[PDB]
Design a protein around this ligand. Structure first.
Ligand code: FE
Ligand code: FE
Ligand code: FE
Ligand code: FE
Ligand code: FE
Ligand code: FE
Ligand code: FE
Lengths: 168, 168, 168, 168, 168, 168, 168
């Protein structure tokens, strides 16, 4: 790359790893979406929410692919591992699994941020802070609040009311 | 003050005391707001309501600071004491505490009104009646009605439904 | 599923296989997009086109996930295999690879259609015909015409002119 | 908190300390506002300006209360100390006191930022930089320029002209 | 300065150095603009682009002059050195020279950023990150992509087509 | 140049000299602008005015670069010398220095005009008359009138009133 | 003429000569236009451009007829000589011929201007400067740039691309 400057080989590799983690998260949320779309689950606002989260994670991945090229690194893709489960249980259990995924995503981003800082990559630490770290804290908070509300409403009519009210 | 007329030193002091009581109430409602904003409480319409009540109490304080100057008294501020609790329990318990605060505010305003009347301050008794006493009766009634409804809906899904319906 | 009717296990499995093939095609086009986005390739209308094709293939996958649920089948996801290449060569070679992918997709869809027909699944043969087979013929034709034009314009200024004119 | 991640108890405590400092600054500016509102001071654009600054400092406090909750910390409020003065002297002396308050606020924010950095809290260092440090530099600069202009215009007609022109 | 706080003399000097580098870059792009405006070169969209880049570099300089004043440093200007060349050769050669200038500007900014960080200047590291480092990475990438396209189109009709298409 | 006609080498050289003088004037006004932007000077309408004057002088330079190319001459740039001062004293002293600069610019333009006339360059004498000599007379008149008004208003409140009123 | 004042017979004659030269140039461009309109040449944007240039030269002639009458001179017309060529070769050859015509027109205008100046005709020297000399310098520059671009693009596809792009 004619452009590459202050962009360490270790940071380039760490960006490729993070691209795969974001695509994995996109795939988990796609699975959760179509689980809540099942004819025997049928919580459509939850299903729609997880499809939107799947789309957001795919955009997290593509913006890292864009910055990889911007800095003169090379995008190297890996297999996207299928999610841990085919079925996600109650709304409460699924949102608990989503919270765990968001915290895993955050640990991964903080590791990437650390690697960038270790190599004095002021451009990429700022990029990760501005475009990833604040959104990730807001997402973890959102999922923690939804878990609190799913515990509050309980199973049955509460789950129905949550689906009808929480996303409108 | 070139303006001061029929404005008793005792009434001036009582207005300064009431300014501090209104600021204290503002601080209690700010505390209640951010308690309902907690990731493990997560009742956002209740949180928003208490922030609006905090703003209203701060306006109660500043309008008394304005009338203090209007009458040629001197504003003398005191420490704003922190609220009695850091945590406010169930929605029902928090609204019961808010009702008790509103009735305390009302007793304080009626005392101020009495002091003004004892000194034949027709301007300030009218000011307190028009701008404070009617609003305070309406606020106490509002909180009593919300306590009745929080008892009616009960804990769990009822608390969620109250948050989603009561403020829209 | 309370809904499932005239929907054979062999057809359900074939729909899950096709979902994976569509997600794979989405991943190939994402790879091609970011290759043409490289600072040493820099053909942005080609890059944008392949991102649009990536989005389209993901929609092909999610519409099969949707019809799986409509028929009372159960979505079962597999790993999304990384593409065969990290780098895709000239515009001509990349569009030739895309054409090969589209013909592979079409063979896969015709196999799924055959399996549906073997089980007298009149709903799913019509669904595949209406929503997949005509779009797939149009996509193969589009790619064949783009290959003809990339051969016509040749390398260098022709590739630049193709990028500037072909997607306007 | 189900959300809390990479958020040290020392940083949580430092955020609570800063919340109190912002509320204190809000109270100082409310005092200055009603001083310039006095019937024997009567500089209404200065009074309005300090009320706006009071409102801004309360927003500084509530945004730190919000980020405390976002990170899964727990808001702990303390008494809001009354300002050092009841009366604030000339416009020049009041704006000099305000400048000193702003520099105190800035030292406090840089201490909080240092504590966050010591614990590798990349989210909170970015939050403080983006939402606090640039605004604080601009506020100190604004107050320094207003002090320069209040020295330039001098007492009497200059103070009147400053009030009429500086906030238009 | 009544405002100056956490602003080291070494950082103040480094900001004055960067102001001169930005003005130098503005002058180089003004030279390149009027070279492409020559009656025997006559590539007017390239000329207009370099005039826009000259204007942008002057804005880079004036925003550093502004932050120098915001922090209570003192602007000290130096001679603006004339560019290395009076004539810039082919479009390809001129865009290669511009890419080298942008990478020089970036190394200079990263040095300024390092100096600020060495003095724990959280305000100025964030200012440089937010307003300089991402724009500088995007500019280097833009110039690298234009060099790739000028190699692709070749001399003669390709240069003409690039001028007519690349800036539209 | 295929275009060059009735364009003497002495006139071409004199245009290059005038381009440098205009860029020098631009740099002086940029210095004066950021001097009035200082936190201890803080006359923002004067600062804005000098920034506009800096922009105008840069346009004077670029229009001479344009006419150099129109006549088939060749732009040759020289170093832009830093201004005589880092600090410009009172508003009155700065405007007196600006007036001296404008009269210097005018003497320089009349010398260029004389050189053009000596070589019977009817095109360039008309160009200098139409685009430079009348605006230069109006600029000198503007600065003389501002000096008269800065003497009238005197130091202190007068300087503040001039800043607030003269550019509105 | 009751109007004639400071208008020498030599200047009147020189204006009649220049009217004929402008009409001649109009006829040359009409010829070039219909040459590019030929069924075996077929460059329609070049054809349209030369028709516009023919119209402009006729306007140059009629404005000199108008000023002849304004000054109380008498218009005396001569034969309009047919152009030097019936056919104008390549686009490059035609634009080189046009450039030579424009420089001839300019020599003629400067000789007219000299004659006017020799008779102290301040009105007519100003008229020629304002309405003829700057337009003529801009026209020569335009033709020189078009010759540079026609050399750049070369014969064949380049000539086609020039016709399609240069006049839109
Ligand atoms: Fe993510
Ligand atoms: Fe109240
Ligand atoms: Fe497909
Ligand atoms: Fe603050
Ligand atoms: Fe720059
Ligand atoms: Fe000038
Ligand atoms: Fe003419």
């Amino acid at each position: 790359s004619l452009a590459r400057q202050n962009y360490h080989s270790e940071v380039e590799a760490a960006v490729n790893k993070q691209i795969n983690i974001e695509l994995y998260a996109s795939y988990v949320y796609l699975s959760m979406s179509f689980y809540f779309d099942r004819d025997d689950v049928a919580l459509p606002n939850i299903a729609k929410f997880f499809k939107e989260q799947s789309d957001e994670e795919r955009e997290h991945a593509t913006e890292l692919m864009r910055v990889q090229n911007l800095r003169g690194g090379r995008v190297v893709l890996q297999d996207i591992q299928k999610p841990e489960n085919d079925e996600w249980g109650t709304a409460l259990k699924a949102f608990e699994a989503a919270l765990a995924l968001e915290k895993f995503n955050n640990e991964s981003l903080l590791k990437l941020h650390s690697t960038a800082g270790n190599h004095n990559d002021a451009h990429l630490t700022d990029f990760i802070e501005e475009k990833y770290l604040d959104e990730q804290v807001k997402s973890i908070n959102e999922f923690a609040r939804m878990v609190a509300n799913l515990k509050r409403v309980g199973p049955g009519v509460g789950e129905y009311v949550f689906d009808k009210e929480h996303f409108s």
